[PDB]
Amino acid sequence: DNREIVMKYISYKLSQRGYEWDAGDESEVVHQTLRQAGDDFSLRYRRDFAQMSSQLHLTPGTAYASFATVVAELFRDGVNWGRIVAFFEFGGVMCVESVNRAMSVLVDNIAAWMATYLNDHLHTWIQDNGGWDAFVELYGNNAAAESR
Numbered sequence: 001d002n003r004e005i006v007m008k009y010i011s012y013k014l015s016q017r018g019y020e021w022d023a024g025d026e027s028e029v030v031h032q033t034l035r036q037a038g039d040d041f042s043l044r045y046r047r048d049f050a051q052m053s054s055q056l057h058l059t060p061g062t063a064y065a066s067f068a069t070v071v072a073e074l075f076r077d078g079v080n081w082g083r084i085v086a087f088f089e090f091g092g093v094m095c096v097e098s099v100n101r102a103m104s105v106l107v108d109n110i111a112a113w114m115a116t117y118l119n120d121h122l123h124t125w126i127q128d129n130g131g132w133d134a135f136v137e138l139y140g141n142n143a144a145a146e147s148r
């Protein structure tokens with residue numbers, strides 16, 4: 001389910017910062033692989049997230065517009081797994097930031113916007129491209145390459 005993968009992902013990100021989410025908490029290997037891929041994405045692009053956040057100026061009034069803007073740029077050159085990982089980690093980072101700015105009402109909204117975008121705009125692609133199992137396979141190949 002699209003709701004479930006978003007929910008597990010967001011739950012994990014918030015739990016990483018000690019935040020337990022009222023509405024929170026696909027194979028287990030899929031969730032685990034997406035968790036690691038997102039964590040590596042954040043490690044590499046930490047500085048970029050910090051700069052982008054500053055540009056977006058998160059508020060309840062502008063959160064949806066910022067979410068839509070980011071996602072439109074992310075997928076401007078089409079969908080691939082790497083960009084889907086970016087998507088998840090962007091939604092995660094935005095949920096952590098919401099909580100940090102005493103805007104925790106946004107977490108539920110961001111999770112809904114993520115699940116909707118998955119449903120309306122990534123679902124076809126995912127299925128055409130072998131589903132979440134293909135993501136796991138890709139991750140494996142890349143891990144073996146990065147090892148050697």
Ligand SMILES: CCCCN(CCCC)C(=O)c1cc(C)n(-c2ccccc2C(=O)N2Cc3ccccc3C[C@H]2CN)n1
Nearest residue numbers: 045048049052069070071073074075082083086087089090
């Ligand atoms: C995490 C989603 C960032 C999407 N974005 C910012 C939109 C601001 C309105 C992008 O410009 C964007 C577009 C693409 C294809 N991507 C990437 C996808 C995979 C790997 C890197 C990028 C990328 O282009 N960047 C990574 C990143 C991460 C966090 C914050 C901003 C950016 C932008 C660039 C930085 N070099 N990021």
